[PDB]
Amino acid sequence: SELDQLRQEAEQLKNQIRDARKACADATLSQITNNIDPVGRIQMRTRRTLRGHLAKIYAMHWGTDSRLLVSASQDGKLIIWDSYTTNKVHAIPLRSSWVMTCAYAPSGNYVACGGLDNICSIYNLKTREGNVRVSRELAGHTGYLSCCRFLDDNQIVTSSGDTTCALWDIETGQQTTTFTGHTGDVMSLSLAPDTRLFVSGACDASAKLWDVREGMCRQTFTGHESDINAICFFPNGNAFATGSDDATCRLFDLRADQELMTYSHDNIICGITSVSFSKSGRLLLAGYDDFNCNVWDALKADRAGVLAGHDNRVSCLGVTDDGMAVATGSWDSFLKIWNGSS
Amino acid sequence: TLSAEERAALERSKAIEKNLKEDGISAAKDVKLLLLGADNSGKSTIVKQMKIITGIVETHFTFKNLHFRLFDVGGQRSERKKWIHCFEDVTAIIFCVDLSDYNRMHESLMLFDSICNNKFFIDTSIILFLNKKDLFGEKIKKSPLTICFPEYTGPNTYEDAAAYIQAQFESKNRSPNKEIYCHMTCATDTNNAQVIFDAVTDIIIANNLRGCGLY
C-alpha cells in the first residue's frame, strides 16, 4: 500500500524532471554550432614513447607542471616520467599489482593509486630519506577502486565498485563524506576546476553531479545505454563528457541539466575507456577498445582525427594543463606523447 | 645529457630501467592461476600446503621448482566483467565445483559457461575440480542424480553419475583450442598440488611450442 503509492510518486517526479528538461530544450547544440567552421583535420605525431612498463597500463595522470606524469601498470610498478627527456624520475613498487587508477597531486608532492585491493594508497614523493614511501592507505571501500583525484595534499576523492564515492581526509585516514546513490559500480570521476563539484559515471548508465562540501547528489544525467567507463569535465566547469561501452560519447550540460551532443560513428562498435578535453575544450579525445584514439570536434561532433599508435586497448589518456600534448596509455605497455606541427 | 645534472639524471633513469627488467624477469617465472567456483565449492582449501600472502586474496606456494600464485576473486561482489580482464594473462583457471550440492550445481554450470566462453579467456585452459566426490557417492544412494538433472537417464551408480556431471561442464566449451583438465577429488585428498602441476606443465609445453615456433 504505502510502498506502491511511494513508487508511483517517483514516476511522477521522473516525468516532472523529463518535462522540465524538455521545456528548456529550445534548440540543439548542433544547430547552434552549424555556422562555425570545422577544426579541419587534426594530425598528431608520436613525439615520445615511454617504455619500461612490462604489463598492461591501466591509468596515467599528468602533473600540473605539464612535464611530469605518473602511470600505473599491473607489473606492480608506479612510474613517474620526465616527459621532456623520457627519463624515469621514480619507480614505485606497488604492494598490490591489480592497480586500476592513479593520480598526481596538484602540488606534486604525492601520488595515489589503487585497484582490486580496495585501498587508495598515498605515496610521498618529497621525503628527506630520498625514496618514495607509502604515507597513507585509505581503507573503507568494499569494492575495487576505479578512480581517484586529489583536491589538495590533504583531501582526495575516490570512486569504487561498491556503488559509492568517498571524500577522504588523508591526514586522519578517514572518509569525511560518502556519496551514495549509484545503483551500479562507479567506474570514473572527474573534478571540477574549482574542486567544489565532481561528476561520476557508474555501470547504471547514469552520471551524477555531487557537491563536495554539502555531500549530496545535485543532478543525475542519463542517456547512455551501457556502463559508463570514463568522464571528464569541460574546461570551464559548466559541462562534462562521458564515455560508455555503447561506443558513444555524450556531452552533458550542468545548467541545462541534459545531454547536448552525442559523439558516435557507425564504424565504432567498441567500448570507450578514457575521455579528455583540449585546453580550450574544442577537442574531445576518447580512447577506444579498437586500439585507437579518436579526436572529436566537441562543438560539431565531427571526428577530427585518429591517434593510431598502439597494438592493444587504449586504456587511458590525458591532456597537459598547458594543453601542449596528450598522453595515451595502452594495454600494449607503452605510453605515447602526441602533438601537432605547424 | 649535456648538463652535468642532466647526465646524472640520465644515469639515474638508466639504473631504474635496469631494475625494471630484473623485476620483470623474476615476475615472468611465476605461474599465475585464477581461482574460480561457487560460493562454497572448496576453493578455500584446494591446496593444503598453500599459504595466503573484501579484496582479492592472493595465495602462493612452490611445488617442484615452480612458483604458483593463486588469486581468489570471490570477495569482489561488484560486477565481474568490469575487472575480469585484469586476469587476461593468467596461465590457467582453476574452477571448483561441489558435487554434493545440487542447488548450486546449476549455478556452477552457468558460471562455468560465462568464464569458459569469456572474450578474454579464449586460449586460457581450465583445471576443473569436482570436489567432495566421496560425499557425492554417499549421497547418490538416497538422492538420485535426476533431482538436479531431470534430463539425466543413465544409471544411478556413482561412477556414471560423476561422469555425467563432468560431461555437462565440458559441453560448455565451444572452442576446440581450449583444454579442460577435470579431476575428481575428495576432502581428504592431498595430491591436488600434483594435479595442478601436471596440468600446468602440459599448458607450459603448449605455450613453449608456440614460443619455439613449432605451433
Partner: single-chain antibody, 230 residues
Framework: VQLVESGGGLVQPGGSRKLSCSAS????????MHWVRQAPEKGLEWVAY????????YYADTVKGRFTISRDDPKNTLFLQMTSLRSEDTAMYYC??????????????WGQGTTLTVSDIVMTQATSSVPVTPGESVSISCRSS???????????LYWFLQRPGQSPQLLIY???NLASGVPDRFSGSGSGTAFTLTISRLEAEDVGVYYC?????????FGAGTKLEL
C-alpha cells in the same frame, strides 16, 4: 638524516690517510656523494664525486691521481683514500649528499666534517665582508666567468650558508629555488653571469659566510665567500 665523518687527524707529509663517511637515516645508495674541503680561514673546495651506483667518478685536478673515492652501499659508508698528502691538503673535509632527478635539490645535506692536518669556471665574490643590522634587507652578489644558464632553462647556481662552527647548509639551488627548511625571506635572483642573494629582514641566525657554487659542469667551483657581521 645523518652524515658522520671519521679518520681525520695529524699526518706526516707524503703519508696516507683514509676518511670514512657513515650514513644513517636515508637511502644512501640512492644519493650521489661529494667530498668538499675547506682550508682553515679559506673557502670551500670540491674534492671528488661518486655517483649513485658507482658508475661515474670525478676528481678535482689538484687531487686527481692521489685521492680515490669509493662507497660501500650495504654498509652505508663513504670512503676517501688519500695518498701522497701535501701541506696543501690540510683542511676540514665535508661529506655531502646529492641526488639528481628532475626537480631534485642537490647538495641539500652536509656532514659535520673531519679535520686533516699535514705537518674551470671562476666564481667571484669580491665583497669579503658586509656589515649588517637585524631587520634590514641585505643583498649578496656572485659572478661567474661563464654563463651558468644552460639551454634547458636551468641556471646551475647554488647558495650555501656556513654559520660559525657549523657545516654549510643549502639555501638556494639552481639560482632561484628555495631549499627545504629555509625561511621564505631568502630569495635568489640572477641572470647570465651575475647573481644576487637577497635576505629580507635579516636575523641573528643569518650571520655567517655565504658561498655561491656552480654546478654547470665539472669541476665544481666555489666563490671566495661573503661574510655577514653585526
Amino acid at each position: 638524516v645523518q652524515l658522520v665523518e671519521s679518520g681525520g687527524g695529524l699526518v706526516q707529509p707524503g703519508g696516507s690517510r683514509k676518511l670514512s663517511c657513515s650514513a644513517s637515516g636515508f637511502a644512501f645508495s640512492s644519493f650521489g656523494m661529494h667530498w668538499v674541503r675547506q682550508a682553515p680561514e679559506k673557502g670551500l673546495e670540491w674534492v671528488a664525486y661518486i655517483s649513485s651506483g658507482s658508475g661515474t667518478i670525478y676528481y678535482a685536478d689538484t687531487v686527481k691521481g692521489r685521492f680515490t673515492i669509493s662507497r660501500d652501499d650495504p654498509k652505508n659508508t663513504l670512503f676517501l683514500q688519500m695518498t701522497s698528502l701535501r701541506s696543501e691538503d690540510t683542511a676540514m673535509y665535508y661529506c655531502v649528499r646529492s641526488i639528481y632527478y628532475y626537480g631534485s635539490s642537490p647538495f641539500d645535506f652536509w656532514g659535520q666534517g673531519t679535520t686533516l692536518t699535514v705537518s674551470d669556471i671562476v666564481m667571484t665574490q669580491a665583497t669579503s665582508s658586509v656589515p649588517v643590522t637585524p631587520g634590514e634587507s641585505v643583498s649578496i652578489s656572485c659572478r661567474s666567468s661563464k654563463s651558468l644558464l644552460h639551454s634547458n632553462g636551468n641556471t646551475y647556481l647554488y647558495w650555501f650558508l656556513q654559520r660559525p662552527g657549523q657545516s654549510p647548509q643549502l639555501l638556494i639551488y639552481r639560482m632561484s629555488n628555495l631549499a627545504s627548511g629555509v625561511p621564505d625571506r631568502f630569495s635568489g635572483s640572477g641572470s647570465g653571469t651575475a647573481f644576487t642573494l637577497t635576505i629580507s629582514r635579516l636575523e641573528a641566525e643569518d650571520v655567517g659566510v655565504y658561498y655561491c657554487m656552480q654546478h654547470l659542469e665539472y669541476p665544481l667551483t666555489f666563490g671566495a665567500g661573503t661574510k655577514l657581521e653585526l
